[PDB]
Each structure stands twice: as C-alpha cells, then as structure tokens.
Swiss-Prot record:
Entry similarity comment: Belongs to the dynein heavy chain family.
Protein name: Cytoplasmic dynein 1 heavy chain 1
Coiled coil: 91-144, 433-496
The protein's role, per its UniProt record: Cytoplasmic dynein 1 acts as a motor for the intracellular retrograde motility of vesicles and organelles along microtubules. Dynein has ATPase activity; the force-producing power stroke is thought to occur on release of ADP. Plays a role in mitotic spindle assembly and metaphase plate congression.
Organism listed in the record: Homo sapiens (Human)
Pathology linked to this chain's protein: Charcot-Marie-Tooth disease, axonal, type 2O: An axonal form of Charcot-Marie-Tooth disease, a disorder of the peripheral nervous system, characterized by progressive weakness and atrophy, initially of the peroneal muscles and later of the distal muscles of the arms. Charcot-Marie-Tooth disease is classified in two main groups on the basis of electrophysiologic properties and histopathology: primary peripheral demyelinating neuropathies (designated CMT1 when they are dominantly inherited) and primary peripheral axonal neuropathies (CMT2).
Transmembrane domains' residue ranges: none
Amino acid sequence: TEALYQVGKEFTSKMDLEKPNYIVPDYMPVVYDKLPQPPSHREAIVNSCVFVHQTLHQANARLAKRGGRTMAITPRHYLDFINHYANLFHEKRSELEEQQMHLNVGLRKIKETVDQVEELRRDLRIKSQELEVKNAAANDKLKKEEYAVLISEAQAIKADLAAVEAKVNRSTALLKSLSAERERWEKTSETFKNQMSTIAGDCLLSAAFIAYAGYFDQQMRQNLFTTWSHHLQQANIQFRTDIARTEYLSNADERLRWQASSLPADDLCTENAIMLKRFNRYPLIIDPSGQATEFIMNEYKDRKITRTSFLDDAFRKNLESALRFGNPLLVQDVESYDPVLNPVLNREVRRTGGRVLITLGDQDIDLSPSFVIFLSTRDPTVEFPPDLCSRVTFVNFTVTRSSLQSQCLNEVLKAERPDVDEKRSDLLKLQGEFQLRLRQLEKSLLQALNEVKGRILDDDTIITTLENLKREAAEVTRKVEETDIVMQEVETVSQQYLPLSTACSSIYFTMESLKQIHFLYQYSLQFFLDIYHNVLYENPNLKGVTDHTQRLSIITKDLFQVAFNRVARGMLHQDHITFAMLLARIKLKGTVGEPTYDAEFQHFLRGNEIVLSAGSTPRIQGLTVEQAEAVVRLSCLPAFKDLIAKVQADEQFGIWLDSSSPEQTVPYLWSEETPATPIGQAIHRLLLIQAFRPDRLLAMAHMFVSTNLGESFMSIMEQPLDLTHIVGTEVKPNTPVLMCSVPGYDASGHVEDLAAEQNTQI
C-alpha cells in the first residue's frame, strides 16, 4: 500500500489536484495507514487511487470463490490507471477550458452587436433629422442648378438611410434568431464552475474503468464502478453521476464511426471500443463471435492493417514489417502466444544515436512511432500466465442480456414485418445523419462568431453565414421532430415482439450456464442463432398462417421446442429433465395470468437448508424420520402451514404413501384462498412429492413439464436419432459433427451406415 501510494503521489504531482475548499469527511476512508490525519485533496485522491487498485484484488477473490476465471492484477495495472488518470485529466481540462473560452467570445460578440444596433438605430434617427433639414433647406431655396445638386445629395442620403434601416431590420432578425443560442451558452457558462469541480472525480472513475474493468463482464463492471463511486462519496470527492461512462469517454462523432465499422450497438461494446482507443498496454481482444476482429480491421483499414496468427510461419516476417514501417498489426490465436513479443509488449526500446531500436529476437529493428498491435482470441475459457496478463490490457467482448434482446427483436422484426424493419433501419440512419448535421451546424455557428474580427454587422457575409446556419438548423430540427413521430409508430409494432426477445435471451443464457453441470455442454452464441433462424424461417407450423398474432404464438412455442431438441441431442439423458425444468420456468415467467411462484420454487430448490431442532420436529405416525423432517420444512410455506393436520386427518394417506405411482394421484393437502391454475397445482404436487416420495420426484418433474410445455415436449428424445435430416439440413459444412459417446458405445458405425444410405463416399 505504501508502494502504491508513493507511485501515485509521485506521478500525480504534475496534476493540479488542488482544492483549498475541500472538506475532510468525519469518517475518512483511509487505505494508506500512514496517510496524514488531516489529508488534503491530493492525498485523498491518491488514497482513492490505492483503494481502486485493491478492490480489483477482492473482486478477483470473489470470482475465485464462485469458480470464475480470474486474471492477475499487477502493478502495471496501477501504472496504466494513473497514466489514464493523468491523460484524461489534462484532456478534460483542456477541452472544457477551450469550450469556456469559445462561449465567452461568442457571448461577447453578441453583446457588442446588441450595443452596435442600439447606436446604429440612434444613427438612423440622426440621419432622418439630417434628411428633414436637407429637404427643408432645398424646398426653401427652390421656393425663392445648384438646387438640383442639393436634392441629389438628399436623395443619396435617402438611399443611405434606406440601407441603414434595412440593416436594422435584418440584424434585429439575426439577434432574434440567435436569442436561443445566447440563452443556451449563458447556461453552459454558469455550469462551467460546476464542471471544473468534478473533473478530478470523473477522471478517476473513467481511468479506473479503462485500466481494470476490461476483462470483466457487465455485472462485475457495474459492481466495480459502484464500489469506486461509493468510496469517492465517503471521501467527499466531487464527481458527476448523471453522465454515462460511454458518453464521458467518447464523443458522438467517434461513436458514429464505430457503428459504421460494424461495432455492435451496446454499452459494453461501446466501452470495449473506448478501451481499444485509449489503451496504454497493447489490447488483448476476447471475442468468440469475431465481431470485434472485423471491427478492428475496418477501423484500421485505411492504415493498412494486416491479419496474422502466432501459428503462421510468416508471423515473424509480418511482425518485423509492422515494427519497421509502423503499420497496425492484428495477431490471432494468442493462446499460442510467442515469447518473441515480450520486448515489444513491454516497450523496451533503446534510443541510441537518433535511432529507436527494439530488440526482436536476435535482431535490432528501427521502431516506427505509429506501430500498434492487437492480440485476439476466440476462446473465452482460455487461461493466461500472469506475465502475459501484465503485458496486455484485456478487452472482453462478452454478450449481455440487453444486447441479445435487441438482436433477437430486430431478427424477428425483419422476419415477421420486413416493411417495419426496413422503415426502422432507414429511420435510424436518418436520425444519425440529422444529429451529425446539428453538431456541425452548432460547431460552425460557434466557430464563425469566434473567428470574426471586429463586429458581425461590419461584414455582410458573416450575417449571411449566421442566418444560413440558423435556418438549416431549424430545418434539420423539424426533420428530427418528424422522424421521431414515425419512430414512435415503429416502436408500437415492436412492443408485441418484445416478450419473444426476452425469452430468447433467457433461453440462451440457460444454454450458456449449462456448462456448470457438465464440461461437455459447451454452446456458442451461433448455435442459438441457428435455432432462432430455424424457428423464424424454417418453421413448418408457420406454413400458411397469415395472422401476425398467431404466427408469433407459433414462433414462441417452437422456439422452446427446437431449443430443447437441438440441445438435448448433445446431453446425457439424466440432464434432459434438468434443461426441461428450466425451460418450463422461463415459459412460466413469461406466461400471462400466472403468479411468480418464487416462494414455492425457492423451497423446491433450497428447502433442505432450513434449520430444524430435534424437539421441533414431531413424530407423526406412519411417516419416516426423514419424511417427518420434510413435512416440518414444508410446513414453513403458508399454503402448507396446516399440512400436519391434513395428513393425520386423512385415513387414505397410507394407501397413497405406498402406491406404485403416487405422483398421478397426489392428494389436495394445501389450502388456497382462490382456485389455483393447473401450473400452480403442479408446483404444489411437485413440492408434496419431494417431501413424501422423493423417489418419484423425477416422474412428477416430467408432469410439471407437460403442464407448461405440453405432453409431447420431451417425446422426441425417445425416438432413434435421425442423422440423415440433421446432417443434410441442420449442419453446415464448416461445423464439425461430434460423435460423443459414453464408454462402451461407438458412434462411428452409424456414420458408415448413414453414408451408405446417401451413397456418399467417406
């Protein structure tokens, strides 16, 4: 902690970090034990910097306890954090000071113009008085050759006054048009002081996000940010909580170029794109889908980026050319990392005799300052040694629930309502162009006022430019309004398909977490997309159906069926029911008219952890000790509060207890104020079976699936596998077909028979 504090104190010395009005909180969160008791603003900032680094250690520890993959936290992470904190602080102060100077000049120019029109209106009155004097003098002289010249001079003044009064009206319109701009710029100038105070806190959070939260997923990224934010609140360090980190670390123009480079429209993807720009250590990209790899190539296409791999024999030649010529390089298969990159990643360069030399292998290469390298991998499950983790910054392109919901909502919209999807896609493009035009017009309006020397009214072209920029802004603003209302009608169409997208995200994340129960249950995002594509388009049920509501219900029903059929074909039969139960829960959460059943399912899964005393559990006649203990545990639920009385009062309970199939005739032993739904009855019977006859729990579980997903939901798994249909249609040539078999079974013999039937040489 002392080492971290000293490094932060030394590096942030050049930073301002000075706040004479800073108030020390009563409970100062102290991380450095030797921190002065009355700390200053700078010492509080460095203390927060040390705290941020340590929270990554506990975050890794928490992930380790949950069996989660972790990356080593090294002092190079701390160095990157303070490097980013210094760079962001200087950039934010420079931009906001420049913005304040621009606004003050623009406000000053308007105020001077307001003074100019006041005096120029006064000049108009004097000129009118001069015209009256000249006209009266000319009339008096005429009423008594030279008089023709006198009236000619008066006519010239009349034209000059006409130009002046035309300048009065035209300028007054310009000030009226610029009234809104003056009001907005004045408000921003008032908020300038507020923005100054929060630079230190905002930059600390932004720098920590780039340096640390790259590898973690969305939930952990939010957890780290909140923990950092709370510490700053307890330390009385000002920071803004209204702006998003994606908007604070990047501008709108850069974000538009990112989506043009095939970057997915997501907050996590935007954060990952920010890290790929402001990185200090060379990034290591983790994207199983490969979309980040395409985004990197598109972003650096103009700079002649090259794709290579560690396995390629030409990697050394490609790396040498990139270092020598300063070209961007993208290296894949980083799980086979070549230690030849160690000096390059560590930036160990020698500046001798005017040459920047990098020692690659046994050769010294002139390193160009424009060189940049990106490491990529398609395996999210890969381990990395601690030295590699210190040399690179991780940029994990995980899939979030919100991102998948948007993808599935767009996919069903394109399949079901192609006219709405193309109308929506065009509207997004139009709004993106309109907002870009507004920024250019606002920037041009501000830049034009600053560059004028003298006054606006002195030169006519400035008045023309200001009016043209304002009228174009109004036309674009009206276009923005009209696209929004057309956007609103598009949303109403997509609201109907919204529940389907939620089910798709829930289904896939169930598949993703299926790896916890068995190592073999590895499913990629593309596997789910093939299921979704097959349901949406290759749906026999949607053969001649024309109603949109009927087609949506068919798609929702077939989405669960096809997902089970494909996944369970590569699962052990003992795990088939487990996947079906969770699929039923997903359908239950999206069913209209069904209670949450959270309490019932809570006791179904963790009902055995209830603490029971020896004297608390009575001895009910006809029930075994473990059976009696289950009844007491089941008695905690309100619906089973009087379960013991009902069991004792039932003389036929002994017949049901030893019955061959008790799950089919479960007695009504629960009390409800209203008639429960058939699903609700199944859950209560499921709880009763678990308490009394645990051997029949699996049989009752299948009945529960039949209540939700239908009787024939799992019936397809009892038929022999149809390899002809799946291989011919549902299997792409690029996708290998895995014959996984339990010991004692060999699936190759099916393959020759399958090939023989199709007359395909193998």
